[PDB]
Amino acid sequence: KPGDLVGVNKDSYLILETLPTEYDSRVKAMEVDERPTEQYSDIGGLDKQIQELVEAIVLPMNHKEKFENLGIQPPKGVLMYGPPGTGKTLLARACAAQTKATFLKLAGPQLVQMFIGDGAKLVRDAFALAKEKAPSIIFIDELDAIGTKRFDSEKAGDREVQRTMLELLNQLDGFQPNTQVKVIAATNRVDILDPALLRSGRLDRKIEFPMPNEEARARIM
Amino acid sequence: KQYEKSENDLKALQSVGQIVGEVLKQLTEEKFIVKATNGPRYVVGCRRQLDKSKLKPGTRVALDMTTLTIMRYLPREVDPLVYNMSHEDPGNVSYSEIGGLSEQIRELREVIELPLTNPELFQRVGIIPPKGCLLYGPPGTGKTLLARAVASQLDCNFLKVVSSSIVDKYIGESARLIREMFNYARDHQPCIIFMDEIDAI
Amino acid sequence: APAVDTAEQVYISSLALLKMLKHGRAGVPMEVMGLMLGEFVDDYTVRVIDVFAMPQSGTGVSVEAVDPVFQAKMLDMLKQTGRPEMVVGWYHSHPGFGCWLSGVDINTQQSFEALSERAVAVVVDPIQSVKGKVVIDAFRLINANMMVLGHEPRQTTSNLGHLNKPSIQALIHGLNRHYYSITINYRKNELEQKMLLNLHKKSWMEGLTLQDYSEHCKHNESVVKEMLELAKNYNKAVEEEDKMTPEQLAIKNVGKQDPKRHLEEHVDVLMTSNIVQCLAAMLDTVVFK
Amino acid sequence: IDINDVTPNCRVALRNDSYTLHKILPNKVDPLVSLMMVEKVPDSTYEMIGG
Amino acid sequence: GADREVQRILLELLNQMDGFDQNVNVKVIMATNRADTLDPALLRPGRLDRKIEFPLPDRRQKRLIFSTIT
């Protein structure tokens, strides 16, 4: 059916077989086969933050039947914002271990690319695959790269970045599920970010990360 | 049963790799001028058997690769993408989940829903129904939820199109998709066409 | 590699050749085929008296294209005519290709060869033809090795041979592998030649006929009016045309779209037209009364 | 056919069979002349400015 | 590649435009609404002779138009 891939022989022309889906290389290289867990212990302290994060992502993946009984829509994405060095990367590795699922590494800079109009196709493919891999959590680093939409830009303003910013919303919207893809987002500030992205049905929880407390640093040591 | 399938394959190989074209303009009954969907423009013939009358510039023809004679007639040109948009009409979200917006919902119907059933109502007024609808709003409102949600309930032909990746760097390839949806709708009348995130364009 | 074979000179009758053209034009572009009826005379000559077709199919020039139903049916009827003829070989047409056989086509030639080894495949081209002399070639078809060794010219003896190129180096190579062009002669004579000559006995009425006088006037008017337009360039033409270089002359004295060529052409139509119309009117007058 | 086809900065015909040089084409063009040509700049005499 | 095609298309067009003068044909008519997203090379004369001005309508001009639509 139109849009599906099929092989044809370039020398003389027959459809050999029908070929299954294909995901470009540029997204493929960024991916991970899952790396060892640091868990909650290595990121000592940061207790309140851990409690919010665990409730949002990990418990709906495992005990998903109970969550349907509550009636609730499981998070579109949760957000982590606040100063670096608070162990966000560590915390991500821990999340992954509790759920028993794939953390699909995504870089915000990889999505905007050197080819034009292809860069937009890249965002569609990255979320598209996460569904196919099984239920997934997408760990996106530095979403500040994808775009900040305050546009009125009468002169230029790039707009490889504009296409990707809009496409990212579309995948979060319930044209395709958002109960299957969860987004664990880490960005250093929300000041840089635009409200189109933040909302409360693109990124549901807003978890601030303050710099470690006095007891927290002793645990880290 | 297997032998029947095997037989068509040989037809391609005898013509050596059949190619699609279109009749640009009819020179005379024997000779048509064909512009190719593959590349070069061609002067072509027709089989004795294949009638001239059938071919039209609105539609596509097929050519033997090695002698450039029209073997037969092919149907109207439609993009692969547009077939996927027509299908995408049930994306779920019922009329209940889009409520409270109800005053604004009534306004969308006047424009979209009324001309389908009868253009006659606006005709009595002596006015042609107003062109184009723009949905805009702050984020999270459900401007896209609304357009999508009614399209599923009626289950009318509705093309749902993502236009935030339809532009490519491939010159001439971006043009075709955008044209095709307007043309198509005129054919599959009545129809609604919704483009989402055309902020991009 | 050594074997003691002789080549088949294909003698095509006038009746037979014309039918082969007929079938091939019709089939376009799809390749069609048929069987040849004839007699085997001497020690190499297969003569084609007549040809009939095996069905038009897009599965053409194949073993499949060949219909057992046609072949039996014709042969019972042919017994009655007082000509039950031998199948000397088979003809096919390629109007998608030239004189280079297709890959299916070589196997099909082979099956005919098993039945009677005096079998040939004649390729008929009418829109992949470069010659109006009727682009046809004959192949018995023998293996590649025979060419490579140089055995294949030892077997052909009692041949002249020939080589033409409808379509490039690829065709030449295909031809050489086969058996190249083995000589085609024609069995023709003056009675057959006179049949083909004809046009219209209706020439009888037409030579005498002349049209309404108002029409005679239309013709004369149209030409004199035309001649006025070209006349203005003509003045320049005679004054100059020192240039003899076709490209420069063309721009200079409107050499291309020449007033001389056309004005002469015009005087000549008008003169001849007026003579035949006038001459007929007068001839008829005297004779009928 | 032609020994002038070896001369640099000459537009040349080729006949394909390996991209072999045929002869040099006597009609040449440069982009600088083509710039003047496309614009068709208005050209005017001393009178217009004159006075 | 994209940027180059559009550029080529326009050169061919200028060249063919100049072709009209020898024959009875009247040249290209085009509208510039925004002139800053247009080449000034394409606004140069010598192929243009007549330039049409439209301004904004005044009061009286406007009134007439308003009756036709209503």
Curated annotation (Swiss-Prot), chain D:
Sites of Phosphoserine modification: 18
Q: Where in the cell is it found?
A: Cytoplasm; Nucleus
Q: Function of this protein?
A: Component of the 26S proteasome, a multiprotein complex involved in the ATP-dependent degradation of ubiquitinated proteins. This complex plays a key role in the maintenance of protein homeostasis by removing misfolded or damaged proteins, which could impair cellular functions, and by removing proteins whose functions are no longer required. Therefore, the proteasome participates in numerous cellular processes, including cell cycle progression, apoptosis, or DNA damage repair.
Assembly with partners or alone:
Component of the 19S proteasome regulatory particle complex. The 26S proteasome consists of a 20S core particle (CP) and two 19S regulatory subunits (RP). The regulatory particle is made of a lid composed of 9 subunits, a base containing 6 ATPases including PSMC5 and few additional components. Component of a complex with USP49 and RUVBL1. Interacts with PRPF19. Interacts with TRIM5. Interacts with NDC80. Interacts with PAAF1. Interacts, in vitro, with the thyroid hormone receptor (in a thyroid hormone T3-dependent manner) and with retinoid X receptor (RXR). Interacts with ERCC6.
Protein family: Belongs to the AAA ATPase family.
Please report the name of this protein according to its UniProt entry: 26S proteasome regulatory subunit 8
Which organism is this entry from?
Rattus norvegicus (Rat)
Q: Which gene encodes it?
A: Psmc5
Counting on the full-length protein, the chain here runs from: 103 to 153 of 406
From Swiss-Prot, chain E:
Q: Where in the cell is it found?
A: Cytoplasm; Nucleus
Q: How does it assemble?
A: Component of the 19S proteasome regulatory particle complex. The 26S proteasome consists of a 20S core particle (CP) and two 19S regulatory subunits (RP). The regulatory particle is made of a lid composed of 9 subunits, a base containing 6 ATPases including PSMC4 and few additional components. Interacts with NR1I3. Interacts with PAAF1. Interacts with TRIM5. Interacts with ZFAND1.
From the entire protein, which fragment is shown?
Answer: 280 to 349 of 418
In the record, the note on similarity to other proteins reads:
Belongs to the AAA ATPase family.
Name of this protein: 26S proteasome regulatory subunit 6B
What's this protein's function?
Component of the 26S proteasome, a multiprotein complex involved in the ATP-dependent degradation of ubiquitinated proteins. This complex plays a key role in the maintenance of protein homeostasis by removing misfolded or damaged proteins, which could impair cellular functions, and by removing proteins whose functions are no longer required. Therefore, the proteasome participates in numerous cellular processes, including cell cycle progression, apoptosis, or DNA damage repair.
Going by the entry's taxonomy, the superkingdom of the source organism is recorded as Eukaryota
